[PDB]
């Protein structure tokens, strides 16, 4: 399925943007999630970078969390399931970090792309749009 392959691409892009923590990549990841999410899901994502305990304020460049996509099942019923690993490393230090495994359940749709600017279509050509997101331990 062309649709299946394309859904997998965007679900993958979304999880990577949303679960990665990299100081030098943060603004771009943040905007990618923002652009690919509904207002409600976007504000909910953003809450982690708000306030005193905002993640960037706490970590700076001393922590990096990298994502590895393990498997993806879209279901054609507007929900996709993404299994992935997170590896967190304290950048100044050595070793390999902790790796943990998760399952993201993602509600998503595609919105008419004609209703966006050509510029916005350069980052989201198909109107991919995440309406709900949850992450649960394996």
Swiss-Prot record:
Q: Which GO terms describe its biological process?
A: protein secretion by the type IV secretion system
Report the sequence similarity comment from the record. Belongs to the virB8 family.
Q: Quick one: which gene encodes this?
A: virB8
Reproduce the miscellaneous comment text: Transcription of the operon is maximal in early exponential phase.
Q: What induces it?
A: Specifically induced within macrophages by phagosome acidification. Induced at 37 degrees Celsius in minimal medium, suggesting that nutritional stress is a regulating signal.
Under which name does UniProt file this protein? Answer: Type IV secretion system protein virB8
On whether Zinc-finger is a keyword of this UniProt record, the answer is no
Gene Ontology terms, MF aspect:
identical protein binding
Which span of the parent protein is shown here? 97 to 234 of 239
Protein function: The VirB system could be required for the establishment of the replication niche in the host.
Question: Topology with regard to the membrane?
Answer: Single-pass membrane protein
- Gene Ontology, cellular component aspect: plasma membrane
Location in the cell: Cell inner membrane
**Entry keywords, A to Z:** Cell inner membrane, Cell membrane, Membrane, Transmembrane, Transmembrane helix, Virulence
